[PDB]
Amino acid sequence: PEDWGASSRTSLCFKLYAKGKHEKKTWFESRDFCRALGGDLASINNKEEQQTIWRLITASGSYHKLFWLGLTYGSPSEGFTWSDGSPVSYENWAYGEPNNYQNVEYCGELKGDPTMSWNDINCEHLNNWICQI
Ligand SMILES: [Ca+2]
Prior knowledge:
(Microbial infection) Interacts with Dengue virus. This protein has helices at residues 27-36, 47-60, and strands spanning 14-17, 40-41, 66-75, 79-82, 107-111, 118-121, 128-132.
């Protein structure tokens, strides 16, 4: 769908998900859902993509929700990775994150407010999610 608010043209498309609580998915379920449509969980690779997603969040009127992104812990040599294979270069971790709290947080979620900050959280948490194609 045409992004009238974009400041530059791209054919890449982000889509926000989950209107109701029962729809919410684990990180793995969200990854699989987006791949079943031919894409993947969203990666956020620069500030422009972050702003594009923030436009989608405000346009959807679904505020202050948490969304799975494609962030997942890779290894000590890599740190975090994106499920779509992009290197984690741009980062927007919240203060004190990622913190692998209690040794069980290996997936990344977006706080859908103007900060657009990321936090690592347990992959089995039920969240909204963002796909990209
Ligand atoms: Ca955390």
